[PDB]
Amino acid sequence: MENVVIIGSGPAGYTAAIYAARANLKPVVFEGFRNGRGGQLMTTTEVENFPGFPEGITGPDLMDRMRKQAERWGSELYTEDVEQVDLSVRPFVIRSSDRELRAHSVIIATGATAKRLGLPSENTFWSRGISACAICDGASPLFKNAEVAVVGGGDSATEEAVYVTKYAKHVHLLVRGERMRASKAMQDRVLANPRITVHFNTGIEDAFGGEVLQGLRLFDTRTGEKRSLDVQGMFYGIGHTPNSKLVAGQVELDEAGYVKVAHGAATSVPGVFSAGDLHDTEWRQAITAAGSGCMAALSAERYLTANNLVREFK
Amino acid sequence: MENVVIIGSGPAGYTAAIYAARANLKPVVFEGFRNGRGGQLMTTTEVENFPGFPEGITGPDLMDRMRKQAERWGSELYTEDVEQVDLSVRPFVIRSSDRELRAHSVIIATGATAKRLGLPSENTFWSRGISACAICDGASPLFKNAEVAVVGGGDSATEEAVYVTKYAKHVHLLVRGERMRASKAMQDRVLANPRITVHFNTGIEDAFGGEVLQGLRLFDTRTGEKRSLDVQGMFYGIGHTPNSKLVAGQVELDEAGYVKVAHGAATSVPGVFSAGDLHDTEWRQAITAAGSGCMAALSAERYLTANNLVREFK
Ligand SMILES: Cc1cc2nc3c(=O)[nH]c(=O)nc-3n(C[C@H](O)[C@H](O)[C@H](O)COP(=O)(O)OP(=O)(O)OC[C@H]3O[C@@H](n4cnc5c(N)ncnc54)[C@H](O)[C@@H]3O)c2cc1C
Numbered sequence: 001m002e003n004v005v006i007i008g009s010g011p012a013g014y015t016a017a018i019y020a021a022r023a024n025l026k027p028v029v030f031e032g033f034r035n036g037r038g039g040q041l042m043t044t045t046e047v048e049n050f051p052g053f054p055e056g057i058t059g060p061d062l063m064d065r066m067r068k069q070a071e072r073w074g075s076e077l078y079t080e081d082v083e084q085v086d087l088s089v090r091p092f093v094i095r096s097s098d099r100e101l102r103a104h105s106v107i108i109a110t111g112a113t114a115k116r117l118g119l120p121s122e123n124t125f126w127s128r129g130i131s132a133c134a135i136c137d138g139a140s141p142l143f144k145n146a147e148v149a150v151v152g153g154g155d156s157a158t159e160e161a162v163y164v165t166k167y168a169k170h171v172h173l174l175v176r177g178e179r180m181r182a183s184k185a186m187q188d189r190v191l192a193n194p195r196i197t198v199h200f201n202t203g204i205e206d207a208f209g210g211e212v213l214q215g216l217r218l219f220d221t222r223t224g225e226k227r228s229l230d231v232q233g234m235f236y237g238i239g240h241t242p243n244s245k246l247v248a249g250q251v252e253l254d255e256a257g258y259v260k261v262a263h264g265a266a267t268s269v270p271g272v273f274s275a276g277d278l279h280d281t282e283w284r285q286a287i288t289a290a291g292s293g294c295m296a297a298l299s300a301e302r303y304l305t306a307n308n309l310v311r312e313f314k
Numbered sequence: 315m316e317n318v319v320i321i322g323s324g325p326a327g328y329t330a331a332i333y334a335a336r337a338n339l340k341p342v343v344f345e346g347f348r349n350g351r352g353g354q355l356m357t358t359t360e361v362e363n364f365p366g367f368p369e370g371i372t373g374p375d376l377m378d379r380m381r382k383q384a385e386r387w388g389s390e391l392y393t394e395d396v397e398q399v400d401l402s403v404r405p406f407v408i409r410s411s412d413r414e415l416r417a418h419s420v421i422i423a424t425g426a427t428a429k430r431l432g433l434p435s436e437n438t439f440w441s442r443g444i445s446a447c448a449i450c451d452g453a454s455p456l457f458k459n460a461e462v463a464v465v466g467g468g469d470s471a472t473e474e475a476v477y478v479t480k481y482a483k484h485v486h487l488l489v490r491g492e493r494m495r496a497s498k499a500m501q502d503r504v505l506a507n508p509r510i511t512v513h514f515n516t517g518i519e520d521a522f523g524g525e526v527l528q529g530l531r532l533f534d535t536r537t538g539e540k541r542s543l544d545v546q547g548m549f550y551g552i553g554h555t556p557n558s559k560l561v562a563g564q565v566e567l568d569e570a571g572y573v574k575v576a577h578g579a580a581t582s583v584p585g586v587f588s589a590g591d592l593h594d595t596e597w598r599q600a601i602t603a604a605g606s607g608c609m610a611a612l613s614a615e616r617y618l619t620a621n622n623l624v625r626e627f628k
């Protein structure tokens with residue numbers, strides 16, 4: 001019988017764990033394995049906007065520090081994916097590949113789905129023409145005077161397209177719909193730039209090449225008409241998807257799948273708290289996710305206390 | 315003409331500065347001087363719950379790192395108190411002891427008022443019987459089998475009183491009103507404990523002693539009747555006061571003086587954003603203040619952009 005079970009090992013999950021462990025709750029953390037232990041910062045290079053690191057810190061080193069801190073203060077860390085939760089009963093039921101636990105309270109910190117398309121040949125060209133971060137990778141020798149694609153039509157994606165025109169001979173911006181979702185300034189900047197072609201009503205079937213990317217198999221999203229595009233790079237500027245499937249149908253979600261929260265972390269289910277990118281439609285930073293993890297942990301501790309649910313030993 | 319002026323050098327102010335500087339806004343930060351540069355963490359010993367520091371970090375070292383990071387990315391840092399702001403005109407007017415600036419946007423991150431009473435003899439016995447942090451200081455040799463006072467009747471204060479009964483022969487809990495504001499469990503724990511006396515309707519006039527604290531001059535808050543209390547220690551477990559006087563009468567405040575915010579950081583005045591303890595009635599942690607500073611900076615950047623207020627050079 002757990003006081004609290006935390007799901008996720010991003011900055012939200014680990015900050016929640018540090019607060020819950022320091023309150024003597026002996027949190028259990030399902031960190032993920034197939035979901036990617038350590039969250040989105042494991043996939044970046046250098047973090048420069050996490051306060052307390054004036055020299056910068058690698059994503060992996062920052063997340064390693066957070067894990068060590070969680071462990072130091074008494075967190076039980078499982079490198080296991082949660083397969084199923086039951087929030088309709090009390091105590092709550094949490095099932096991983098390896099074990100089933102009951103818990104007086106649950107912190108869900110499952111973040112965003114992986115920034116990738118899942119194309120058949122995606123793993124083939126990963127780091128060999130395909131990149132999920134144009135800012136991290138755009139200046140690489142591979143892309144110097146290349147034709148490249150940027151996937152998406154949002155604010156991030158138009159800025160990423162313009163950035164990459166510093167290095168690439170030509171940028172093909174690939175938009176699913178008829179209209180970019182970026183600001184009109186960003187649109188005038190893109191539609192002006194002589195080194196950007198915007199493809200509207202464009203989806204991606206697969207990537208092709210040899211030892212590295214040589215192009216994309218595309219289709220019109222209205223008619224399915226197919227064509228090929230020769231590019232030596234592809235950057236993902238795709239939108240944020242909250243990873244809420246564990247709780248879909250059990251807590252209130254908005255239209256995009258974000259968990260709805262009150263008072264910083266409270267879900268529609270008493271005793272269930274959300275932290276991080278899972279409910280964040282605005283900021284999507286490691287520092288805001290960490291603050292959110294703290295709010296969920298303090299929220300869980302006050303819920304456990306008010307209901308007299310904490311025991312001396314588990 | 316500033317893009318943004320930040321007031322305060324706590325985790326909120328410096329995190330805002332890092333985000334604004336990295337967005338190329340060349341923020342100016344009025345860090346404070348008489349107000350205490352570096353915020354509340356300058357007054358603590360070891361910080362253990364700021365994610366990314368598994369070994370712990372001193373308050374001063376963590377705040378030194380944040381200052382260096384703010385400076386690295388292009389913040390203009392002034393060790394100056396803001397004396398007056400005018401938020402009724404645009405551009406906004408900000409006046410320090412040394413200069414007067416105009417700004418398209420303002421981030422107020424003025425935090426909490428100093429944790430002290432201002433008693434005439436307070437500076438005399440500071441670190442010599444008077445402490446603002448029972449958790450930091452309770453285990454000190456000075457307090458071993460001493461009679462000590464804890465000021466306040468809140469949740470923090472009752473927990474602090476119980477903590478200090480591990481070390482002190484007797485704890486006098488000094489409450490201004492007739493009732494503790496702590497939970498009924500905390501009250502039963504306190505009123506049970508044979509080593510705690512609760513003084514209701516009790517205020518503090520001054521401290522007395524020689525090279526160290528020997529007691530308090532007290533008064534009944536209903537009649538003003540005076541008495542003396544012999545103690546060799548006094549711990550401040552007093553409540554949180556938001557330092558909102560700069561903006562009092564110019565932005566909407568709640569009854570306790572907290573700035574009212576919408577969408578994470580927006581005040582009642584468009585272009586004016588709040589971050590940190592100044593608007594936080596719930597969490598009051600360095601990590602939640604830092605996340606808040608990020609939200610205010612991103613909010614200011616989007617306001618400046620939407621209104622086309624940013625220039626190439628200032
Ligand atoms: C390329 C890139 C660069 C970035 N750079 C920066 C930057 O420099 N600075 C910055 O502030 N932000 C940056 N971000 C954003 C930042 O990484 C996120 O805002 C932050 O990591 C979100 O934290 P989180 O804890 O909410 O979620 P996530 O980081 O998404 O973590 C969610 C965690 O939950 C786990 N999980 C999911 N489902 C399950 C399950 N069923 N069982 C168990 N565990 C599960 C996942 O494996 C993961 O560990 C970047 C993002 C990316 C993709």
Ligand SMILES: Cc1cc2nc3c(=O)[nH]c(=O)nc-3n(C[C@H](O)[C@H](O)[C@H](O)COP(=O)(O)OP(=O)(O)OC[C@H]3O[C@@H](n4cnc5c(N)ncnc54)[C@H](O)[C@@H]3O)c2cc1C
Pocket residue numbers: 321322323324325326327344345346347348349350351352353354355357358360361362363364394395396397423424425426429446447557560589590591592598599600601603
């Ligand atoms: C003893 C103690 C121990 C603590 N320990 C911890 C802990 O271990 N972990 C934790 O997470 N939290 C801790 N906290 C809480 C934490 O310090 C605060 O939550 C946090 O510092 C608030 O950040 P902030 O930036 O909102 O405000 P503050 O830290 O209060 O900073 C406000 C800043 O604004 C400045 N300012 C005020 N008025 C003006 C003006 N007119 N002009 C210019 N500048 C001005 C002040 O000088 C100060 O620099 C502790 C607090 C105390 C008092």
